Design a protein around this motif. Structure first.
Motif, PDB file in Angstrom:
ATOM      1  N   UNK A 274       1.007  -1.138   0.031  1.00 28.31           N
ATOM      2  CA  UNK A 274       0.063  -0.262  -0.097  1.00 28.31           C
ATOM      3  C   UNK A 274       0.879   1.141   0.068  1.00 28.31           C
ATOM      4  N   UNK A 275       0.485   2.200  -0.734  1.00 27.64           N
ATOM      5  CA  UNK A 275       0.944   3.616  -0.590  1.00 27.64           C
ATOM      6  C   UNK A 275       0.062   4.701  -0.686  1.00 27.64           C
ATOM      7  N   UNK A 276       0.570   5.788  -0.064  1.00 30.06           N
ATOM      8  CA  UNK A 276      -0.205   6.968  -0.341  1.00 30.06           C
ATOM      9  C   UNK A 276       0.151   7.821  -1.604  1.00 30.06           C
ATOM     10  N   UNK A 277      -0.837   8.519  -1.970  1.00 24.67           N
ATOM     11  CA  UNK A 277      -0.340   9.347  -3.298  1.00 24.67           C
ATOM     12  C   UNK A 277      -1.549  10.668  -3.283  1.00 24.67           C
ATOM     13  N   UNK A 278      -0.648  11.746  -2.815  1.00 22.08           N
ATOM     14  CA  UNK A 278      -1.655  13.075  -2.482  1.00 22.08           C
ATOM     15  C   UNK A 278      -1.991  13.717  -3.814  1.00 22.08           C
ATOM     16  N   UNK A 279      -3.318  14.044  -3.971  1.00 19.69           N
ATOM     17  CA  UNK A 279      -3.838  14.969  -4.814  1.00 19.69           C
ATOM     18  C   UNK A 279      -3.667  16.448  -4.299  1.00 19.69           C
ATOM     19  N   UNK A 280      -2.954  17.298  -4.994  1.00 18.61           N
ATOM     20  CA  UNK A 280      -3.382  18.794  -4.548  1.00 18.61           C
ATOM     21  C   UNK A 280      -4.712  19.379  -5.189  1.00 18.61           C
ATOM     22  N   UNK A 281      -5.362  19.996  -4.417  1.00 17.91           N
ATOM     23  CA  UNK A 281      -6.447  20.679  -4.830  1.00 17.91           C
ATOM     24  C   UNK A 281      -6.175  21.386  -6.076  1.00 17.91           C
ATOM     25  N   UNK A 282      -5.041  21.684  -6.315  1.00 16.12           N
ATOM     26  CA  UNK A 282      -4.617  22.327  -7.726  1.00 16.12           C
ATOM     27  C   UNK A 282      -4.416  21.572  -8.881  1.00 16.12           C
ATOM     28  N   UNK A 283      -4.167  20.177  -8.736  1.00 18.00           N
ATOM     29  CA  UNK A 283      -3.861  19.224  -9.846  1.00 18.00           C
ATOM     30  C   UNK A 283      -5.401  18.608  -9.992  1.00 18.00           C
ATOM     31  N   UNK A 284      -6.089  18.287  -9.041  1.00 15.27           N
ATOM     32  CA  UNK A 284      -7.406  17.716  -9.382  1.00 15.27           C
ATOM     33  C   UNK A 284      -8.246  18.985  -9.911  1.00 15.27           C
ATOM     34  N   UNK A 285      -7.852  20.262  -9.520  1.00 16.60           N
ATOM     35  CA  UNK A 285      -8.541  21.282 -10.216  1.00 16.60           C
ATOM     36  C   UNK A 285      -8.667  21.268 -11.543  1.00 16.60           C
TER      37      UNK A 285
END
Lengths: 49, 49
Positions: B21-32
């Protein structure tokens, strides 16, 4: 009732600003903007210091 | 000398269990920018996408 509605343009509002749009965003905090000249000067003196 | 008799062994193996398992953060800007690209059209800047 409907909260009062006839549109964007019916008296006098748009020169607090000028514009350019800015859609694509997502890159700046305290970037640049320029021009490249300065303020009037020197033909009254002596043969001045 | 008739004493010999072949033998067959029967071993069974367990499967066990692992995972990664791993985490993969999406910035509000990239998903923006994401949100408009799914409906990419004449709008939504291409260099941006």
């Amino acid at each position: 009732n409907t909260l009062n509605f006839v549109r964007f343009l019916e008296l006098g509002l748009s020169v607090a600003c000028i514009c350019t749009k800015f859609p694509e965003l997502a890159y700046v905090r305290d970037g640049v903007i320029q021009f490249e000249v300065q303020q009037p000067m020197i033909a009254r003196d002596g043969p001045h210091p | 000398h008739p004493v010999d008799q072949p033998v067959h062994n029967y071993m069974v193996k367990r499967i066990h269990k692992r995972s990664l398992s791993a985490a993969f953060a999406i910035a509000s800007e990239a998903l923006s920018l994401l949100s408009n690209t799914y409906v990419d059209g004449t709008e939504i800047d291409s260099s941006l996408r």
